[PDB]
Amino acid sequence: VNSFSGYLKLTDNVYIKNADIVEEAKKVKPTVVVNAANVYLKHGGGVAGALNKATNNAMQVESDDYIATNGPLKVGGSCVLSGHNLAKHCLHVVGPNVNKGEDIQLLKSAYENFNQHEVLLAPLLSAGIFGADPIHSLRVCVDTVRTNVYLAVFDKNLYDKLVSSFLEMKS
Ligand SMILES: CCOP(=O)(O)OP(=O)(O)OC[C@H]1O[C@@H](n2cnc3c(N)ncnc32)[C@H](O)[C@@H]1O
């Protein structure tokens, strides 16, 4: 388990790889894969849709059952459900939807949930459908997370941009 390979070490606890999070999860077998979730755990597109699709929709059914007895998550909040065939556990974390004016400071709260887990395979929270700048999401991850986070960025051009601007800013 947690056999991560081919990552660029950004800090003592943050790693980044140009990879699709589903394919990484199948290779690595992480204890925790992170979902970029929304408060009702409707796994439509992006990471959530890809993770759910790779579980043959088991993640959505599990999530419906969770919501039915617990109600929606809060923005910046999280829950631990099954990792299905992809991981031991999936940490569903709700970043703020910046497009709808949700407070971008909640991205800090979202990444704080990573600190409850020794090691995680994760995407850049809020950087896709939710409209936060990916460079900002990476910065918040680096400053907030103290546990071992392995970031999967599937798009090569975004990966190159993220690494370049991480170096520039780091000084
Ligand atoms: C409703 C929640 O909205 P939120 O913005 O929080 O999450 P998202 O829309 O899933 O995007 C989060 C970030 O992961 C990237 N991304 C998308 N698919 C994959 C994938 N298969 N593997 C690795 N990275 C991926 C996406 O391009 C964006 O950089």
Closest CA to 126 of 149, 99, 148: 99
Ligand 1 pocket residues where CB is under 6 Å: 20-22, 36, 38, 46-48, 50, 95, 123-130, 134, 152-154
Q: What angle do CA 66, 70, 73 make, to 5 degrees?
A: 90
Closest CA to 58 of 37, 83, 38, 95: 83
* Interatomic CA distance for residues 88 and 76, integer angstroms: 22
Measured from the Cα of 152, ligand 1's closest atom is 23
Q: 16 with 141: CB under 8 angstroms?
A: no
Q: 33 with 166: CB under 8 angstroms?
A: no
Taking only Cα atoms into account, the Rg of the chain, rounded to an integer number of angstroms, comes to 15
CB proximity list for 147: less than 8 A, separation 6 or greater: 13, 114, 115, 116, 117, 118, 119, 120
Q: Whose CA is nearest to atom 4 of ligand 1?
A: 126
3-state secondary structure string across 89-142: EEEEEECCCHHHCCCCCHHHHHHHHHHHCCEEEECCCCCCCCCCCHHHHHHHHH
Ligand 1 center–CA 118 separation, angstroms:
22
Q: Which domains does the chain have, with CATH numbers?
A: 8-171 (3.40.220.10)
* Interatomic CA distance for residues 73 and 76, integer angstroms: 8
Sign of CA dihedral 157, 162, 163, 168: positive
